[PDB]
CSV table of C-alpha atoms in Angstrom, one decimal:
chain,number,residue,atom,x,y,z
A,1,UNK,CA,72.0,147.8,102.2
A,2,UNK,CA,75.6,147.7,103.5
A,3,UNK,CA,77.7,146.4,106.5
A,4,UNK,CA,80.9,148.5,106.4
A,5,UNK,CA,82.1,147.5,109.9
A,6,UNK,CA,81.9,144.8,112.4
A,7,UNK,CA,80.8,143.8,115.9
A,8,UNK,CA,83.8,142.0,117.3
A,9,UNK,CA,84.3,139.9,120.5
A,10,UNK,CA,85.4,143.1,122.1
A,11,UNK,CA,82.1,145.1,122.2
A,12,UNK,CA,82.9,147.6,124.9
A,13,UNK,CA,80.9,150.8,124.1
A,14,UNK,CA,79.2,153.5,126.1
A,15,UNK,CA,77.2,156.6,125.3
A,16,UNK,CA,78.7,160.0,125.7
A,17,UNK,CA,76.1,162.4,127.3
A,18,UNK,CA,78.4,165.4,127.9
A,19,UNK,CA,79.3,165.7,124.2
A,20,UNK,CA,80.8,169.2,124.4
A,21,UNK,CA,83.2,168.3,127.2
A,22,UNK,CA,86.9,167.8,126.6
A,23,UNK,CA,88.0,166.1,123.4
A,24,UNK,CA,84.4,164.9,122.6
A,25,UNK,CA,83.2,168.3,121.2
A,26,UNK,CA,85.0,167.9,117.9
A,27,UNK,CA,83.4,164.5,117.3
A,28,UNK,CA,80.7,165.2,114.7
A,29,UNK,CA,77.5,163.7,113.3
A,30,UNK,CA,76.9,163.8,109.6
A,31,UNK,CA,73.5,163.6,107.9
A,32,UNK,CA,73.0,163.4,104.2
A,33,UNK,CA,69.5,163.2,102.5
A,34,UNK,CA,69.6,160.7,99.6
A,35,UNK,CA,67.0,158.8,97.6
A,36,UNK,CA,64.1,160.1,99.7
A,37,UNK,CA,65.9,158.8,102.9
A,38,UNK,CA,69.1,159.6,104.6
A,39,UNK,CA,72.7,158.4,105.0
A,40,UNK,CA,74.6,159.2,108.3
A,41,UNK,CA,78.2,159.1,109.3
A,42,UNK,CA,80.8,160.5,111.6
A,43,UNK,CA,83.7,163.0,111.4
A,44,UNK,CA,86.0,165.2,113.5
A,45,UNK,CA,86.6,169.0,113.5
A,46,UNK,CA,90.3,169.7,112.8
A,47,UNK,CA,90.3,173.3,111.7
A,48,UNK,CA,88.4,176.6,111.7
A,49,UNK,CA,86.1,175.4,108.9
A,50,UNK,CA,87.1,171.8,108.4
A,51,UNK,CA,86.3,168.2,109.5
A,52,UNK,CA,87.8,164.9,108.4
A,53,UNK,CA,85.6,161.9,107.4
A,54,UNK,CA,85.6,159.2,104.7
A,55,UNK,CA,85.6,159.5,101.0
A,56,UNK,CA,82.7,157.0,100.9
A,57,UNK,CA,80.7,159.2,103.4
A,58,UNK,CA,80.9,162.5,101.5
A,59,UNK,CA,80.0,160.5,98.4
A,60,UNK,CA,76.5,160.4,99.6
A,61,UNK,CA,76.1,164.1,98.6
A,62,UNK,CA,76.6,163.0,94.9
A,63,UNK,CA,79.2,165.7,94.3
A,64,UNK,CA,77.3,168.6,95.9
A,65,UNK,CA,78.7,169.5,99.4
A,66,UNK,CA,75.6,171.5,100.3
A,67,UNK,CA,73.7,168.2,100.7
A,68,UNK,CA,75.8,167.5,103.8
A,69,UNK,CA,74.9,168.6,107.3
A,70,UNK,CA,77.6,168.5,110.0
A,71,UNK,CA,76.5,168.6,113.7
A,72,UNK,CA,79.6,168.8,116.0
A,73,UNK,CA,78.9,167.4,119.5
A,74,UNK,CA,75.6,165.9,118.5
A,75,UNK,CA,73.9,164.4,121.5
A,76,UNK,CA,70.7,163.0,120.1
A,77,UNK,CA,68.1,163.5,117.3
A,78,UNK,CA,66.5,166.4,119.1
A,79,UNK,CA,69.7,167.8,120.8
A,80,UNK,CA,72.3,169.4,118.6
A,81,UNK,CA,74.1,171.7,121.1
A,82,UNK,CA,76.1,173.4,118.4
A,83,UNK,CA,73.5,173.2,115.6
A,84,UNK,CA,74.6,172.3,112.1
A,85,UNK,CA,77.2,173.5,109.5
A,86,UNK,CA,76.6,173.0,105.8
A,87,UNK,CA,79.2,171.3,103.5
A,88,UNK,CA,80.9,173.8,101.3
A,89,UNK,CA,83.8,172.0,99.5
A,90,UNK,CA,84.9,168.4,99.4
A,91,UNK,CA,88.7,167.8,99.3
A,92,UNK,CA,89.5,164.1,98.8
A,93,UNK,CA,92.8,162.8,99.9
A,94,UNK,CA,94.8,162.3,96.6
A,95,UNK,CA,96.3,159.1,98.0
A,96,UNK,CA,94.6,155.7,98.1
A,97,UNK,CA,93.0,156.0,101.6
A,98,UNK,CA,89.3,156.4,102.4
A,99,UNK,CA,89.9,159.9,103.7
A,100,UNK,CA,88.4,163.3,102.8
A,101,UNK,CA,88.5,166.9,104.2
A,102,UNK,CA,85.0,168.5,104.2
A,103,UNK,CA,85.1,172.3,104.5
A,104,UNK,CA,82.0,173.7,106.0
A,105,UNK,CA,80.3,177.1,105.8
A,106,UNK,CA,79.9,179.3,108.9
A,107,UNK,CA,76.5,178.9,110.5
A,108,UNK,CA,73.6,181.3,110.5
A,109,UNK,CA,75.2,183.4,113.2
A,110,UNK,CA,78.5,183.6,111.3
A,111,UNK,CA,80.1,181.3,113.8
A,112,UNK,CA,82.7,178.9,112.4
A,113,UNK,CA,82.8,175.3,113.4
A,114,UNK,CA,86.3,175.6,114.8
A,115,UNK,CA,85.1,178.4,117.1
A,116,UNK,CA,82.1,176.7,118.7
A,117,UNK,CA,84.2,173.6,119.5
A,118,UNK,CA,87.9,173.0,120.0
A,119,UNK,CA,89.5,171.6,116.9
A,120,UNK,CA,90.9,168.1,117.6
A,121,UNK,CA,94.7,167.7,118.1
A,122,UNK,CA,96.3,165.5,115.4
A,123,UNK,CA,98.9,163.1,116.7
A,124,UNK,CA,102.3,163.1,115.1
A,125,UNK,CA,102.0,159.3,115.4
A,126,UNK,CA,105.6,158.8,116.3
A,127,UNK,CA,104.7,156.9,119.5
A,128,UNK,CA,101.7,155.0,118.1
A,129,UNK,CA,102.2,151.2,118.4
A,130,UNK,CA,100.5,147.8,118.3
A,131,UNK,CA,98.7,146.9,121.6
A,132,UNK,CA,98.2,150.6,122.5
A,133,UNK,CA,94.9,151.4,124.2
A,134,UNK,CA,92.6,153.5,122.0
A,135,UNK,CA,89.1,154.7,121.5
A,136,UNK,CA,86.9,155.2,118.4
A,137,UNK,CA,84.1,157.7,119.1
A,138,UNK,CA,81.3,158.6,116.7
A,139,UNK,CA,77.7,157.7,115.7
A,140,UNK,CA,77.0,154.0,115.3
A,141,UNK,CA,73.8,153.3,113.4
A,142,UNK,CA,72.5,150.6,115.8
A,143,UNK,CA,72.0,153.2,118.5
A,144,UNK,CA,69.4,156.1,118.5
A,145,UNK,CA,70.1,158.5,115.7
A,146,UNK,CA,72.8,161.1,116.5
A,147,UNK,CA,73.8,159.7,119.8
A,148,UNK,CA,77.6,159.7,120.4
A,149,UNK,CA,79.3,156.4,121.5
A,150,UNK,CA,82.9,155.7,122.6
A,151,UNK,CA,84.3,152.2,121.8
A,152,UNK,CA,87.3,150.9,123.7
A,153,UNK,CA,90.0,148.6,122.4
A,154,UNK,CA,93.6,148.1,121.2
A,155,UNK,CA,95.6,148.6,118.1
A,156,UNK,CA,96.4,145.3,116.4
A,157,UNK,CA,98.1,146.4,113.2
A,158,UNK,CA,99.9,149.5,111.7
A,159,UNK,CA,101.1,149.6,108.2
A,160,UNK,CA,101.2,152.2,105.4
A,161,UNK,CA,98.0,154.3,105.7
A,162,UNK,CA,96.2,151.5,107.7
A,163,UNK,CA,95.7,151.0,111.4
A,164,UNK,CA,93.5,148.2,112.7
A,165,UNK,CA,92.0,147.5,116.1
A,166,UNK,CA,90.0,144.9,118.0
A,167,UNK,CA,87.1,147.1,119.0
A,168,UNK,CA,83.5,147.1,117.7
A,169,UNK,CA,82.0,149.6,115.4
A,170,UNK,CA,78.7,149.8,113.4
A,171,UNK,CA,77.6,151.4,110.1
A,172,UNK,CA,77.4,155.1,111.0
A,173,UNK,CA,80.8,155.0,112.6
A,174,UNK,CA,82.4,155.8,109.1
A,175,UNK,CA,84.7,158.8,109.6
A,176,UNK,CA,84.9,158.5,113.4
A,177,UNK,CA,88.2,159.8,115.0
A,178,UNK,CA,90.5,157.3,116.5
A,179,UNK,CA,91.9,158.7,119.7
A,180,UNK,CA,95.0,157.6,121.7
A,181,UNK,CA,95.2,157.9,125.5
A,182,UNK,CA,96.3,161.5,125.2
A,183,UNK,CA,93.0,162.2,123.3
A,184,UNK,CA,94.9,162.9,120.0
A,185,UNK,CA,93.6,161.8,116.7
A,186,UNK,CA,95.8,159.0,115.3
A,187,UNK,CA,93.4,157.8,112.6
A,188,UNK,CA,90.0,158.1,110.9
A,189,UNK,CA,87.8,154.9,111.0
A,190,UNK,CA,86.5,153.7,107.7
A,191,UNK,CA,85.6,150.0,107.9
A,192,UNK,CA,86.8,146.5,108.8
A,193,UNK,CA,87.0,142.8,107.9
A,194,UNK,CA,84.2,140.9,109.7
A,195,UNK,CA,84.8,139.5,112.1
A,196,UNK,CA,88.5,139.9,112.4
A,197,UNK,CA,89.2,143.6,112.9
A,198,UNK,CA,88.0,147.1,112.1
A,199,UNK,CA,90.2,149.5,110.2
A,200,UNK,CA,91.1,153.2,110.0
A,201,UNK,CA,93.1,155.5,107.8
A,202,UNK,CA,96.4,155.9,109.7
A,203,UNK,CA,97.6,159.5,109.8
A,204,UNK,CA,101.1,158.8,108.7
A,205,UNK,CA,103.7,161.4,107.4
A,206,UNK,CA,102.1,161.5,103.9
A,207,UNK,CA,98.6,162.0,105.3
A,208,UNK,CA,99.9,164.7,107.6
A,209,UNK,CA,101.3,166.6,104.6
A,210,UNK,CA,97.9,166.5,103.0
A,211,UNK,CA,96.4,167.9,106.2
A,212,UNK,CA,99.1,170.6,106.3
A,213,UNK,CA,98.7,171.5,102.6
A,214,UNK,CA,95.0,172.1,103.0
A,215,UNK,CA,94.3,173.2,106.7
A,216,UNK,CA,96.6,176.1,107.7
A,217,UNK,CA,95.7,176.0,111.4
A,218,UNK,CA,95.9,172.3,111.7
A,219,UNK,CA,97.3,171.4,115.2
A,220,UNK,CA,99.7,168.4,114.9
A,221,UNK,CA,101.3,167.6,118.3
B,1,UNK,CA,71.9,153.9,103.0
B,2,UNK,CA,75.1,154.2,101.1
B,3,UNK,CA,76.5,155.6,97.8
B,4,UNK,CA,79.8,153.7,97.2
B,5,UNK,CA,80.3,154.8,93.6
B,6,UNK,CA,79.5,157.5,91.2
B,7,UNK,CA,77.6,158.4,88.0
B,8,UNK,CA,80.2,160.4,86.0
B,9,UNK,CA,79.9,162.5,82.8
B,10,UNK,CA,80.9,159.4,81.0
B,11,UNK,CA,77.9,157.2,81.5
B,12,UNK,CA,78.3,154.7,78.7
B,13,UNK,CA,76.7,151.4,79.9
B,14,UNK,CA,74.9,148.5,78.1
B,15,UNK,CA,73.3,145.3,79.3
B,16,UNK,CA,75.0,142.0,78.6
B,17,UNK,CA,72.3,139.4,77.5
B,18,UNK,CA,74.7,136.6,76.5
B,19,UNK,CA,76.2,136.4,79.9
B,20,UNK,CA,78.0,133.0,79.4
B,21,UNK,CA,79.7,134.1,76.2
B,22,UNK,CA,83.4,134.8,76.2
B,23,UNK,CA,85.0,136.7,79.1
B,24,UNK,CA,81.5,137.5,80.5
B,25,UNK,CA,80.8,134.1,82.1
B,26,UNK,CA,83.2,134.7,85.0
B,27,UNK,CA,81.5,138.0,86.0
B,28,UNK,CA,79.4,137.1,89.0
B,29,UNK,CA,76.4,138.4,90.9
B,30,UNK,CA,76.5,138.2,94.7
B,31,UNK,CA,73.5,138.1,97.0
B,32,UNK,CA,73.6,138.3,100.8
B,33,UNK,CA,70.5,138.3,103.1
B,34,UNK,CA,71.0,140.8,105.9
B,35,UNK,CA,68.6,142.5,108.4
B,36,UNK,CA,65.5,141.0,106.8
B,37,UNK,CA,66.5,142.4,103.4
B,38,UNK,CA,69.5,141.9,101.1
B,39,UNK,CA,72.8,143.3,100.0
B,40,UNK,CA,74.1,142.6,96.5
B,41,UNK,CA,77.4,143.0,94.8
B,42,UNK,CA,79.7,141.7,92.1
B,43,UNK,CA,82.8,139.5,91.7
B,44,UNK,CA,84.7,137.4,89.2
B,45,UNK,CA,85.6,133.7,89.0
B,46,UNK,CA,89.4,133.3,89.1
B,47,UNK,CA,89.9,129.7,90.1
B,48,UNK,CA,88.3,126.3,90.5
B,49,UNK,CA,86.5,127.3,93.7
B,50,UNK,CA,87.3,131.0,93.9
B,51,UNK,CA,86.1,134.5,93.1
B,52,UNK,CA,87.5,138.0,93.8
B,53,UNK,CA,85.3,140.8,95.3
B,54,UNK,CA,85.6,143.5,97.9
B,55,UNK,CA,86.2,143.2,101.7
B,56,UNK,CA,83.2,145.4,102.2
B,57,UNK,CA,81.1,143.1,100.1
B,58,UNK,CA,81.8,139.8,102.0
B,59,UNK,CA,81.4,141.8,105.2
B,60,UNK,CA,77.6,141.6,104.6
B,61,UNK,CA,77.8,137.9,105.7
B,62,UNK,CA,78.8,139.1,109.2
B,63,UNK,CA,81.7,136.6,109.3
B,64,UNK,CA,79.8,133.6,108.0
B,65,UNK,CA,80.6,132.7,104.4
B,66,UNK,CA,77.5,130.5,104.1
B,67,UNK,CA,75.3,133.6,104.0
B,68,UNK,CA,76.8,134.5,100.6
B,69,UNK,CA,75.3,133.3,97.3
B,70,UNK,CA,77.4,133.6,94.2
B,71,UNK,CA,75.7,133.4,90.8
B,72,UNK,CA,78.3,133.4,87.9
B,73,UNK,CA,76.9,134.7,84.6
B,74,UNK,CA,73.7,135.9,86.2
B,75,UNK,CA,71.4,137.3,83.6
B,76,UNK,CA,68.4,138.5,85.6
B,77,UNK,CA,66.4,137.8,88.8
B,78,UNK,CA,64.8,134.7,87.3
B,79,UNK,CA,67.7,133.6,85.0
B,80,UNK,CA,70.8,132.2,86.7
B,81,UNK,CA,72.2,130.1,83.9
B,82,UNK,CA,74.8,128.5,86.2
B,83,UNK,CA,72.7,128.5,89.4
B,84,UNK,CA,74.4,129.5,92.6
B,85,UNK,CA,77.5,128.6,94.7
B,86,UNK,CA,77.6,129.1,98.4
B,87,UNK,CA,80.4,130.9,100.2
B,88,UNK,CA,82.7,128.6,102.1
B,89,UNK,CA,85.8,130.6,103.3
B,90,UNK,CA,86.6,134.3,103.2
B,91,UNK,CA,90.2,135.1,102.6
B,92,UNK,CA,90.8,138.9,103.0
B,93,UNK,CA,93.8,140.5,101.3
B,94,UNK,CA,96.3,141.1,104.2
B,95,UNK,CA,97.3,144.4,102.6
B,96,UNK,CA,95.3,147.6,102.8
B,97,UNK,CA,93.2,147.3,99.6
B,98,UNK,CA,89.4,146.6,99.6
B,99,UNK,CA,90.0,143.1,98.2
B,100,UNK,CA,89.0,139.6,99.3
B,101,UNK,CA,89.0,136.0,97.9
B,102,UNK,CA,85.8,134.2,98.5
B,103,UNK,CA,86.1,130.4,98.2
B,104,UNK,CA,82.9,128.7,97.3
B,105,UNK,CA,81.6,125.2,97.7
B,106,UNK,CA,80.7,123.0,94.8
B,107,UNK,CA,77.0,123.1,93.8
B,108,UNK,CA,74.4,120.5,94.4
B,109,UNK,CA,75.7,118.5,91.3
B,110,UNK,CA,79.2,118.5,92.7
B,111,UNK,CA,80.2,121.0,89.9
B,112,UNK,CA,82.8,123.5,90.8
B,113,UNK,CA,82.4,127.2,89.9
B,114,UNK,CA,85.6,127.1,87.8
B,115,UNK,CA,84.2,124.2,85.8
B,116,UNK,CA,80.9,125.7,84.7
B,117,UNK,CA,82.6,129.0,83.6
B,118,UNK,CA,86.1,129.8,82.4
B,119,UNK,CA,88.1,131.4,85.2
B,120,UNK,CA,89.1,134.9,84.2
B,121,UNK,CA,92.6,135.6,83.1
B,122,UNK,CA,94.5,138.0,85.4
B,123,UNK,CA,96.7,140.5,83.7
B,124,UNK,CA,100.3,140.8,84.7
B,125,UNK,CA,99.7,144.6,84.5
B,126,UNK,CA,103.0,145.3,82.9
B,127,UNK,CA,101.4,147.1,79.9
B,128,UNK,CA,98.6,148.8,81.8
B,129,UNK,CA,98.7,152.6,81.5
B,130,UNK,CA,96.8,155.8,81.9
B,131,UNK,CA,94.4,156.6,79.0
B,132,UNK,CA,94.0,152.9,78.2
B,133,UNK,CA,90.5,151.8,77.1
B,134,UNK,CA,88.8,149.5,79.7
B,135,UNK,CA,85.5,148.1,80.8
B,136,UNK,CA,84.0,147.5,84.3
B,137,UNK,CA,81.4,144.8,84.1
B,138,UNK,CA,79.1,143.7,87.0
B,139,UNK,CA,75.7,144.2,88.6
B,140,UNK,CA,74.8,147.9,89.2
B,141,UNK,CA,71.9,148.4,91.6
B,142,UNK,CA,70.1,151.0,89.5
B,143,UNK,CA,69.2,148.3,87.0
B,144,UNK,CA,66.9,145.3,87.4
B,145,UNK,CA,68.3,142.9,90.0
B,146,UNK,CA,71.0,140.5,88.8
B,147,UNK,CA,71.3,142.0,85.3
B,148,UNK,CA,74.8,142.3,84.0
B,149,UNK,CA,76.1,145.6,82.6
B,150,UNK,CA,79.3,146.7,80.9
B,151,UNK,CA,80.6,150.2,81.5
B,152,UNK,CA,83.1,151.7,79.0
B,153,UNK,CA,85.8,154.3,79.8
B,154,UNK,CA,89.5,155.0,80.3
B,155,UNK,CA,92.2,154.7,83.1
B,156,UNK,CA,92.9,158.1,84.6
B,157,UNK,CA,95.3,157.1,87.4
B,158,UNK,CA,97.5,154.2,88.5
B,159,UNK,CA,99.4,154.2,91.7
B,160,UNK,CA,100.2,151.6,94.4
B,161,UNK,CA,97.2,149.3,94.7
B,162,UNK,CA,94.8,151.9,93.1
B,163,UNK,CA,93.6,152.3,89.6
B,164,UNK,CA,91.0,155.0,88.8
B,165,UNK,CA,88.8,155.5,85.7
B,166,UNK,CA,86.3,158.0,84.2
B,167,UNK,CA,83.5,155.5,83.7
B,168,UNK,CA,80.2,155.3,85.6
B,169,UNK,CA,79.3,152.7,88.2
B,170,UNK,CA,76.5,152.3,90.8
B,171,UNK,CA,76.2,150.6,94.2
B,172,UNK,CA,76.0,146.9,93.4
B,173,UNK,CA,79.1,147.2,91.1
B,174,UNK,CA,81.3,146.6,94.2
B,175,UNK,CA,83.8,143.8,93.3
B,176,UNK,CA,83.3,144.1,89.6
B,177,UNK,CA,86.2,143.0,87.4
B,178,UNK,CA,88.1,145.7,85.5
B,179,UNK,CA,89.0,144.4,82.0
B,180,UNK,CA,91.5,145.7,79.6
B,181,UNK,CA,91.0,145.4,75.8
B,182,UNK,CA,92.4,141.8,75.8
B,183,UNK,CA,89.6,140.9,78.3
B,184,UNK,CA,92.1,140.3,81.2
B,185,UNK,CA,91.4,141.4,84.7
B,186,UNK,CA,93.6,144.4,85.7
B,187,UNK,CA,91.6,145.4,88.8
B,188,UNK,CA,88.6,144.9,91.1
B,189,UNK,CA,86.2,147.8,91.4
B,190,UNK,CA,85.5,149.0,94.9
B,191,UNK,CA,84.3,152.6,94.9
B,192,UNK,CA,85.1,156.2,93.8
B,193,UNK,CA,85.1,159.9,94.7
B,194,UNK,CA,81.9,161.6,93.5
B,195,UNK,CA,81.9,163.0,91.0
B,196,UNK,CA,85.6,162.9,90.0
B,197,UNK,CA,86.4,159.3,89.3
B,198,UNK,CA,85.7,155.7,90.3
B,199,UNK,CA,88.3,153.4,91.8
B,200,UNK,CA,89.5,149.8,91.7
B,201,UNK,CA,92.1,147.7,93.5
B,202,UNK,CA,95.0,147.5,91.1
B,203,UNK,CA,96.4,144.0,90.7
B,204,UNK,CA,100.0,145.0,91.2
B,205,UNK,CA,102.9,142.7,92.0
B,206,UNK,CA,102.1,142.4,95.7
B,207,UNK,CA,98.4,141.7,95.0
B,208,UNK,CA,99.5,139.0,92.5
B,209,UNK,CA,101.5,137.3,95.1
B,210,UNK,CA,98.5,137.1,97.4
B,211,UNK,CA,96.6,135.6,94.5
B,212,UNK,CA,99.4,133.1,93.8
B,213,UNK,CA,99.7,132.2,97.5
B,214,UNK,CA,96.1,131.3,97.8
B,215,UNK,CA,94.8,130.2,94.3
B,216,UNK,CA,97.1,127.4,92.9
B,217,UNK,CA,95.4,127.4,89.4
B,218,UNK,CA,95.3,131.2,89.1
B,219,UNK,CA,96.0,132.2,85.4
B,220,UNK,CA,98.2,135.3,85.3
B,221,UNK,CA,99.0,136.2,81.7
């Protein structure tokens, strides 16, 4: 058992039904069979064949990326509007943050994940500040499996590779994109300190280089 | 489900039976009831009423330290030579590392945790280097519940608040002390990247200040 992230006083969450509309389509559901059961998590499409998520999420594959299923725009357990893409290569962030790139294979129709949905825009994070209104959108495990939920709140802390917020998340949210009001990705949710705050990997200048060094078509605004 | 840390090519582990001997007595087993079941982890006694462990371990208490049971020197499920101490106050590291101090209450005999075992010695980490021989000792969840195991290996990376090693650990090891050859604590295990390495919070100068600011009798050698 585990409890990676926290229900906070601010528990303002609603389900996304039109999961392929707008910036939602790159939000991705992750499913990994392990020990006869499954682990699930979240991620975000950022390139032709790439998502971002947590190191501790891809770890569930026990070193083999082909154990990971990525469903971009998952709507529920029996509604994957874009099907699945199978993990191909795990590229951990060399720094100390809980961040990994997962490269995925094209699907059975030779479609690439970044063709069926719009890859997310990465923020340059030059305007990102404390008390900014943000959302964290992904697949919390206290809801029905593979339903997408947006959680609303504010940035309470920015420092180094860490950005913290006052909004609620639940095991399953691991790897969820953090969006600013312009729907750009400022961070990748990884955890929290209960019940004080939840935490994300802040996409600072050094993280951005890692993205640039590995994802040629990354879109940093 | 989760898989926080990794079996690596180096899987050199043995069970500690004399758990109160020497530097082993401060190694601690953590038990947290959650969602009708339980979460378990590891930690290390470092002061009269204090252990170190991970932020993501204490999170299992959902904000209430009294949900946490700490058994220093636990030997097996029916052998707690020092009984249990109940969580009293959670003090997260303000920095970005997966590190928390858990203050515990005295036991039913008014004994303090740092009186029944010798608090561990914290290394100054001025000699700690890559390729140094180390151990990580705690309660891996693939062994019988609350049995103590020492894992042997080498440091492969030191940077910022992160120290990585080539030795194997398993879910349950979260919060385990990392010992150098002088049996001083150089880090606190928190995770890994499968199957490349496992990771700990490196007790650098800034972490040491946090320890000093909160634990008056901390012993930094």
